[PDB]
């Protein structure tokens, strides 16, 4: 899962950049919120460890 | 015409626009992109990214 997360976020960022350059404002607006959510998710590490997005020790928690 | 009498016009004309003849424009920096439209260049960039 860790190896597979960066491609998703970066490819969505590519989508956002493309729609910016093409001047397609509506789609860019629809896509910015997910961009920021992914940014927050990747750069917060709510887990106290703060070394991996998914941590085997923190994983297996029901919440 | 109120004080003299004219003939039918021997030459009809009207207002027109005079400009300086377009010259060979001094080549612009980045004139090497002119053979292809900007949209082609951007599609090239993003096709490179996608490939």
Description:
- Chain B: Belongs to the glutamate-gated ion channel (TC 1.A.10.1) family. GRIA2 subfamily.
- Chain B: It is found in: Cell membrane; Postsynaptic cell membrane; Postsynaptic density membrane.
- Chain B: The chain crosses the membrane at residues 38-51.
- Chain A is mainly α and 63 residues long.
- Helix content of chain A is 59%, strand content 0%.
- Chain A contains 2 helices and no strands.
- Chain A has helices at residues 5-21, 25-44.
- Chain A is elongated, with a radius of gyration of 15 Å.
- The radius of gyration of chain B is 27 Å and the shape is rod-shaped.
- Chain B starts with 37 loop residues before the first helix and ends with a helix.
- The chains are: A mainly alpha (63), B mainly alpha (51).
- Chain A binds chain B through residues 14, 18, 21-22, and chain B through 42, 46, 49.
Brief rundown of the structure:
The PDB classes it as membrane protein. Chain A has 63 residues and is mainly α.
Helix content class of chain B:
25-40%
This entry's quaternary arrangement is part of a larger assembly
Distance between the termini of chain A: 18 Å
Amount of beta strand of chain B: under 5%
Number of helices of chain A: 2
* Helical/strand content category of chain A: mainly alpha
Task: Tell me, briefly, the overall form of chain A.
Answer: elongated
State the helix count of chain B. 1
Radius of gyration of chain A: 15 Å
């Amino acid at each position: 899962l860790r190896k597979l997360v960066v491609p998703e976020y970066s490819i969505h960022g590519l989508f956002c950049l493309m729609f910016l350059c093409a001047a397609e404002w509506v789609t860019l607006g629809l896509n910015i919120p997910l961009l920021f959510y992914h940014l927050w998710r990747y750069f917060h590490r709510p887990a106290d460890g703060s070394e991996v997005m998914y941590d085997a020790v923190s994983i297996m928690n029901a919440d | 015409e109120e004080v003299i009498d004219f003939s039918k016009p021997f030459m009809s004309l009207g207002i027109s626009i005079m400009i300086k003849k377009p010259q060979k424009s001094k080549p612009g920096v980045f004139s090497f992109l002119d053979p292809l439209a900007y949209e082609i260049w951007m599609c090239i960039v993003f096709a490179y990214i996608g490939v």
